[PDB]
Paper text:
The solved structures provide a first view of the structural mechanism underlying the regulatory function of the L-arabinose-binding Nudix domain. The Nudix signature motif GX5-EX7REUXEEXGU (where U is a hydrophobic residue and X is any residue) is strictly conserved in all known active Nudix hydrolases, but it is impaired in the NrtR regulators of NAD metabolism, several of which are known to be enzymatically inactive. These observations suggest that [name] regulators are also enzymatically inactive and utilize their Nudix hydrolase-like domains for ligand binding.
In this study we identified and characterized a novel L-arabinose-responsive transcription factor found in the Bacteroides species, which belongs to the NrtR family of Nudix-related transcriptional regulators. In this work, genome-scale regulon inference using the comparative genomics approach revealed that the NrtR family [name] regulators in Bacteroides and Prevotella spp. control not only the L-arabinose catabolic operons, but also several other gene loci involved in the utilization of arabinose-containing polysaccharides.
Numbering used by the authors:
A (entry chain A): 3 to 225
B (entry chain B): 0 to 221, 223 to 225
Amino acid sequence: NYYSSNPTFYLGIDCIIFGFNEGEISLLLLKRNFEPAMGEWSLMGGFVQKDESVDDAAKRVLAELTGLENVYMEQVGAFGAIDRDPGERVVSIAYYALININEYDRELVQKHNAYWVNINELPALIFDHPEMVDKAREMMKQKASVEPIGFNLLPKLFTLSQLQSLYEAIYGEPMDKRNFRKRVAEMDFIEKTDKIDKLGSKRGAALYKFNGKAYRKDPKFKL
Amino acid sequence: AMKNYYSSNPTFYLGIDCIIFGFNEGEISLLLLKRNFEPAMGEWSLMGGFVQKDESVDDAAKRVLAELTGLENVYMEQVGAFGAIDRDPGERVVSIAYYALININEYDRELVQKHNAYWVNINELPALIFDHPEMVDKAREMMKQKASVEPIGFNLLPKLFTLSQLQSLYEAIYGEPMDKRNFRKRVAEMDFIEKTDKIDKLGSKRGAALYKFNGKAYRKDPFKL
């Protein structure tokens, strides 16, 4: 009764999907195999349905591309400039996700014509997607300094050089090897295993694990 | 082929909701509606509205705020998009919450009276309808974080303020007492907080030195207190 004199709008979802590999952060991007903007680069996206909450729409859109569930996700914001989408008025809610770049459904990715691209060497993204990406990076950077969300970008078992390399990539600057390793030593919820990562016959390094339960007993993450 | 790329999807009401912070006599307050309209007439809520066809989401938030307070060029931050299915039991509404910092000594009182709105101490709030309590919590958390790293607090104060008022404000932001001496030191070292030759006079017996925030000077060189 009360709300009907107001207009209604398409509610897009757009996903900034972060991955980490070989000292580089990358985004999972569509090279669109559909109109509008076929052939152009964009974030993975969709629309909110009547079935679902906005949060669940984000989960669904991410699962449609990657097959993943229970993904670490944060809402970035609601982008609502009038002409952000030239085809129609669409207000899009952006989310970012941190996934293990080693674990996703390769079939689904191939069928969406999607690609991992280094975050500092992105092609031109359509619409206001470049803007969304900028805001997502800034928020993730900020959160990753005060909370251990970084470990979602790594496999369950990781080495310290891998971990250092992650934080070097997040902040785009080198870190002192020595004192970084002391910060981890006195961080109790980062447990050292008896397993090693064996890249090759000449390469090995101790594998560590992130202990979620032990972190929440004392949420003192800072590095 | 893309003929129904858009139209195959549903459309939703886009709500606007404003958490409006004020500060006065050492307390942070929120400007709330005791609704004089339905739904939830007689219950307490945030100031609200809906995005229209001619306007962006941010401009909707400005408009809504202006409808209540008459204020423009207000410091505002988008809090988030709240899109749980049943947040509004009457109808499906995805609402985009904003917070605003205003000077409680300057607003349109008849506009506020028209909307039957009242300032309430943020620690002694009435029950708010729908998911408004969740919006306030998130807004408080965000505003607190931002105020430690940027000088957004000065929007809560008059152009001229005493260090006593400033300290009081930050004590209220952080809900804890601060060391008067160390606080004075951090303000003395900030060049963009200029001391004035004016004093705040309450009676003939009360006086205190007034200060000013110089945004120009600040943006030349950025704040931590």
